[PDB]
Specification:
2 domains; alpha+beta; oxidoreductase; 11 helices; 196 residues; monomer; binds chloride ion; Glutaredoxin; Ribonucleotide Reductase Protein R1, domain 1
Length: 196
């Protein structure tokens, strides 16, 4: 699959759930905690369906996290993606707490300068060091502007083709699910399809 797309489970499974999610969205964090287990044991493990996670990148903080999760091998993506989502409350504090002068650096200057400022402010060096990724490996990841452009293009595809606006959003078998932005609304639609 293309950059910013990641597939969990069997590509030939009949039910394909696409998730448009963002690392800076509180609804996506809550959704991951609520849904990850049940989707795995109920659907993915028995080979009844597969999950395509798309990084819907909303802001440069999101972009910085998505550079990290997309720079690791496919077999590490899902653990890392889940970790950022599950531990969102632990790392996202500077979004609320930072001052004007700090915020200025996230939204101005070149891609490299702002990505480095964000990674510093959000303490991603320490977060990723605690997960085996050293500073040199993280530096290379954060400077991958080519990848940032591809993730931006993937995000633009979601916005343009599917009118994706709020997060998380979902499609099942090509249909974007109206009014469906949490596990409580999603699950009955998944079970209806599985149990047809
Ligand atoms: Cl939820
Ligand atoms: Cl740090
Ligand atoms: Cl498009």
């Amino acid at each position: 699959l293309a950059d910013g797309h990641h597939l969990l489970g069997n590509p030939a499974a009949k039910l394909r759930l696409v998730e448009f999610v963002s690392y800076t969205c509180p609804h996506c964090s809550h959704f991951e905690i609520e849904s990850e287990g049940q989707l795995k044991i109920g659907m993915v493990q028995p080979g009844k369906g597969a999950i395509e996670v798309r990084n819907f990148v909303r802001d440069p903080i999101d972009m910085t996290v998505a550079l990290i999760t997309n720079c690791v091998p496919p077999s590490r993506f899902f653990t890392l993606h889940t970790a950022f989502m599950r531990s969102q409350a632990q790392w996202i504090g500077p979004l609320a707490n930072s001052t004007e002068a700090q915020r200025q650096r996230w939204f101005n200057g070149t891609f490299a300068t702002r990505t480095r400022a964000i990674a510093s402010d959000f303490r991603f060096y320490d977060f990723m060091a605690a997960r085996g990724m050293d500073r040199s490996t993280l530096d290379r990841c954060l400077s991958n502007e080519a990848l940032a452009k591809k993730l931006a293009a993937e995000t633009d595809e979601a916005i343009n083709q599917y009118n994706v606006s709020g997060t998380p959003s979902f499609m099942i078998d090509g249909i974007l699910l109206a009014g469906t932005h949490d596990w409580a609304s999603l699950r009955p639609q998944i079970l209806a399809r599985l149990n047809e």
